[PDB]
Structure formats: structure tokens, C-alpha cells
């Protein structure tokens, strides 16, 4: 079935992404603390709700938070400044905090129930955010023996996420804070905060996709060129 593409709000980042983040894919954004990974997540959670001719998918959102970083006030700000009703935009976000990595993994199964419920309504789930994908795994699986174990558990979690993306035509967007390991996301985007506080994005290990870097700003509309 044909994939959909969610605009990020930045023409530059959209071009880097071939039009936007894809359904039937896991897009991982990685970078240091303060890079803007969670800002992009908030922005996407509003953009996906737009109609397709405005770069959205008329979609609902599910959000798994591991760091208490979801900010309903930020959603409100982005929505208002894009002509949308903040309370309606919030209504179409379903939110859960993951207590630990095992609960995070179970929450993906829990999410499937709502996905099925909304599937043939006019606002099916089209975006599933996991922010942070890795923070609980990093704190729990640590020390001698942990690299293999952690990588195994994370790969299984990502397999579960790939299944939801692919079976239900959803864009999965995940964040990873990075200061040699295998990764199984579909597309990896390195984000950094540069001079002037501009954010800069580069695709990693994607030789057939745009070489170049996108640059964008964090604004009251989420992100913009």
C-alpha cells in the first residue's frame, strides 16, 4: 500500500527527507541533548493532523514518553500559530508515560488496540512517537554483558514498532540521545545545534538519498526554515 509523507514544517528538512517522514518506516532522530529532537516530535504531532494538501495525513497521534518531556503547552502553541484549534489537536494525541523499558515494550502492544479502533475512522493513527527510544535501555542494561542483551531487547522493540508501521500504515518517529552499535531504524537523521542556534540535520548511512544538510529554526510554529 502506498506510503504517506508528513511534512516537518521546514522546506529544507522536507527536501532532505524526500517530502517528509514516511509511513511504513521508523525514522530515528539522534543527537546530543538540546539538539531539537523533542521539538521535531512536537511539531510532527501537529503537522500529521493537517489535511494532505497541507502536508499532513488527517491523522491521530500516539506518544510514548520516557523522560517526561511531552509538553501540551508546546502543542498548543504550534497548533494555534498554524491556524488550528489547540484543544482539538491535543484531543487527537493519545499519550502514555513508560515507567521502564519493559513497560515501554508492552505499551507498543497496548497501542495496537487504539490503532485498530481508529483505523477505518476519518482520523486513523498516522504517527507513533517514542521519545526517548533508548533512555530506559541505557539505564537498565549496563555493564559487562549488557551490550548484547540491550541490543537484542532494543531490536525486538524496534521489530514490534516496524510491524505497527507496516501493518497499519503509520509513521514511527523515535529519538535517541547520542554523545559502533547496530541500528535497525529505517532512516537515521543526525541533528545538531549549530551557530546562532540554527538546527542542522544530515541523513546517516543513506547513500542514495540527498547528500547535503537541512537547516531550520525552532519557532512558535514548531520548526520553520
Amino acid at each position: 500500500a502506498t506510503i504517506g509523507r508528513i511534512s516537518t514544517g521546514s522546506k529544507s528538512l522536507d527536501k532532505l527527507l524526500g517530502g517528509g517522514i514516511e509511513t511504513q518506516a521508523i525514522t530515528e532522530v539522534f543527537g546530543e541533548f538540546g539538539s531539537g529532537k523533542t521539538q521535531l516530535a512536537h511539531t510532527l504531532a501537529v503537522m500529521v493532523q493537517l489535511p494532505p494538501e497541507e502536508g499532513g495525513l488527517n491523522g491521530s497521534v500516539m506518544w510514548i514518553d520516557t523522560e517526561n518531556t511531552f509538553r501540551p503547552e508546546r502543542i498548543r502553541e504550534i497548533a494555534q500559530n498554524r491556524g488550528l484549534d489547540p484543544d482539538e489537536v491535543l484531543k487527537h494525541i493519545a499519550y502514555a508515560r513508560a515507567f521502564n523499558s519493559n513497560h515501554q515494550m508492552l505499551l507498543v502492544q497496548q497501542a495496537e488496540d487504539m490503532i485498530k479502533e481508529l483505523l477505518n475512522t476519518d482520523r486513523p493513527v498516522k504517527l507513533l512517537i517514542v521519545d526517548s527510544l533508548t533512555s530506559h535501555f541505557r539505564s537498565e542494561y549496563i555493564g559487562r554483558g549488557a551490550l548484547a542483551e540491550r541490543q537484542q531487547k532494543l531490536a525486538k522493540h524496534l521489530a514490534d514498532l516496524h510491524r505497527l508501521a507496516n501493518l497499519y500504515d503509520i509513521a514511527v518517529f523515535v529519538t535517541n540521545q547520542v554523545q559502533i552499535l547496530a541500528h535497525s531504524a529505517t532512516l537515521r537523521v543526525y541533528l545538531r545545534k549549530g551557530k546562532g542556534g540554527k538546527r542542522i540535520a544530515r541523513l546517516i548511512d543513506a547513500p542514495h538519498l540527498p547528500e547535503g544538510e537541512a537547516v531550520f529554526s525552532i519557532t512558535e510554529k514548531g520548526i520553520e526554515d
Partner: peptide, 4 residues
Amino acid sequence: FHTA
């Protein structure tokens, strides 16, 4: 999950 709960609505926001």
C-alpha cells in the same frame, strides 16, 4: 494511553 489517555487523550491530551
